[PDB]
């Protein structure tokens, strides 16, 4: 009562991807000094407190993840990873490995694919953290995702930046070096981004801990941007 395709591919599954590439955009970036995420909410009307548009979720003291698709299946997938996460810390004592955490909820997404009477999750996810000194980043697909990026993006302007990064990125980039990376990138796909329409989460490996970024740090860096709309 789900689906399968007439030749290689798979019905519903790919339709539910689209849901994502239509979704809000959001880039995740690795490095060596930690790892930071960021998303481009497209809050249009200004009657909606920006605090609510939840695009990035904490999952453990040391590992968090960012959404893109429908926020129907955003939440439910997190107060559930957030769940599969502490369970693990509980029947071991280990801050749950990130690769594992991923390999869990991405398996769940995968079961929802092949079972009678249940549409897959209209979402892809960006999980990053500190797997014991190793700050890493993953991308989930509404049907399994073994993709450990050094940096990527999902949603609206995927190819826009998912191909910007394609070049200049490098495996040494520092945090304040990747600082801009996402901001500049995110702007390419959003020609006119409010400076709070956006969300920044930092997780430095320098302490196995997750931090926020206040508004206007956002803007004061969205400034190194007017020098990018020139013969390029």
């Amino acid at each position: 009562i789900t689906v399968f395709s007439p030749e290689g591919r798979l019905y519903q599954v790919e339709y539910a991807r689209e849901a994502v590439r239509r979704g809000t955009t959001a880039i995740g970036i690795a490095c060596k000094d930690g790892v930071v995420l960021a998303v481009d909410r497209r809050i249009t009307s200004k009657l909606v407190k920006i605090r609510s548009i939840e695009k990035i979720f904490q999952i453990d003291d040391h590992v968090a993840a960012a959404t893109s698709g429908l926020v129907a299946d955003a939440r439910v997938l997190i107060d559930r990873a957030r769940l599969e996460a502490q369970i693990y810390r509980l029947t071991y004592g280990e801050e749950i490995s990130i690769e594992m955490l991923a390999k869990k909820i991405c398996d769940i997404k995968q079961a929802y694919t092949q079972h009678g009477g249940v549409r897959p999750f209209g979402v892809s996810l960006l999980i990053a953290g500190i797997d014991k000194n190793e700050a890493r980043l993953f991308e989930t697909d509404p049907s399994g995702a073994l993709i450990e990026y050094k940096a990527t993006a999902i949603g609206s302007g995927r190819p826009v930046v998912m191909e910007l990064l394609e070049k200049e990125y490098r495996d040494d980039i520092t945090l304040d070096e990747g600082l801009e990376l996402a901001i500049t990138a995110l702007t390419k796909a959003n020609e006119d981004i409010k400076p709070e329409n956006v969300d920044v989460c930092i997780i430095t490996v320098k302490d196995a801990q997750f931090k926020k970024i206040p508004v206007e740090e956002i803007k004061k860096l969205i400034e190194k941007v007017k020098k990018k709309l020139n013969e390029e």
Binding site: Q58, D60, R82, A85, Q86, R89
Partner: protein, 202 residues
């Protein structure tokens, strides 16, 4: 098996006895009985190890989850009313164990809660203690405690509860552990430094 909790001005002090007591036999010459569940909360277990043991892990995980799902570090008097609930689940069942939770409320200040196996909970405004050798430690407080005391006058009185009990209880009295929860955090005292105190004492 012997713990103490008490409020002294700013925050709250907790101490135990690193003594595991296997019937006639002294089993552990250093067994934790003081755990920090969240950055603002911590507790003391007394009694059935393997039981409280799980009750700790089968809880911290419920904290460092609530913290996430809703920012606020599980407000102590809230996390407590879990245990009150968690235990009582096993009333129809075999549950058991003692417990003191002591942590700083984001706003409402310092809090100190006592907890019996069934699910009985009370906020202890003054001081409370529990353990094999509790009523020994108790007597110490009930005649050495004043509303105000101090940050210092607390951790002193604190030891000196264990000091008696630990040498007047067959079951308590091997080594000692101590941490203090206050607004900005929770300090596990690394044994060596604990000692400093009763030296400067009598």
């Amino acid at each position: 098996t012997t713990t103490v909790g008490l409020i002294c001005d700013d925050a709250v002090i907790l101490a135990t006895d690193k003594r595991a007591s296997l019937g006639n036999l002294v089993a552990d010459k250093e067994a934790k009985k003081l755990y920090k569940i969240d950055d603002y909360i911590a507790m003391t277990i007394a009694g059935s190890v393997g039981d409280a043991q799980a009750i700790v892990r089968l809880l911290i995980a419920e904290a460092k989850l609530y913290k996430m799902r809703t920012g606020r570090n599980i407000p102590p008097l809230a996390c407590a009313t879990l245990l009150s609930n968690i235990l009582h689940s096993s009333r129809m069942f075999p549950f058991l164990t003692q417990i003191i939770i002591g942590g700083y409320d984001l706003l409402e200040g310092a809090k100190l809660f006592s907890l019996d196996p069934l699910g009985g909970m009370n906020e202890e405004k003054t001081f409370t203690a529990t353990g094999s050798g509790s009523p020994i430690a108790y007597g110490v407080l009930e005649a050495g405690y004043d509303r105000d005391m101090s940050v210092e006058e607390g951790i002193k009185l604190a030891l000196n509860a264990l000091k008696s009990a630990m040498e007047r209880d067959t079951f308590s009295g091997n080594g000692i552990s101590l941490a203090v929860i206050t607004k900005d955090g929770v300090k596990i005292f690394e044994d060596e430094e604990i000692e400093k105190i009763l030296d400067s004492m009598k």
